[PDB]
Design a protein around this ligand. Sequence first.
Ligand SMILES: C[C@@H](CO)N(C)c1ncccc1F
Length: 171
Amino acid sequence: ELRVGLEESELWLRFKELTNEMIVTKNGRRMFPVLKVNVSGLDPNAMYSFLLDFVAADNHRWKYVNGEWVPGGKPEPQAPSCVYIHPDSPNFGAHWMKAPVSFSKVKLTNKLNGGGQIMLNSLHKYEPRIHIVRVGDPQRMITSHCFPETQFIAVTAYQNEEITALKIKYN
Ligand SMILES: C[C@@H](CO)N(C)c1ncccc1F
């Protein structure tokens, strides 16, 4: 049976209980923590690509008020559908399953300034989602996993000083 498990779930949860924040910049910022998953029950002989996108979690934006995240207005029009191809794509099931799959090079941006970056809206909540794409398949079979532990708000700067501190502590 295909299983995709979140690595360092305990670490993600320490950020999620504060409300997680990720920085977006003109030139794109790598994530901390890094999304890493373990994979079982692929066909070790088949070839697959791994894709990552970010699903808008709400029909409103957020604001940090009196040390609390609160609904902060109506949303902006949704960010363009940005998909990151894991640089090991395409590869054998055996490759994907032998060691955790790390998305360490993906960059979050608030400008469509190219470079395979993911465009997000500041002060909007996103949930990372991994797709597994079987190569050479006439049915173009895809599997999608969502990682609710990894929810965060895109920010141009940290709002919660505890998040700022957590990021320095564990990174
Ligand atoms: C929560 C911590 C242990 O305090 N832990 C599970 C960690 N896991 C991965 C990277 C860094 C970590 F520190």
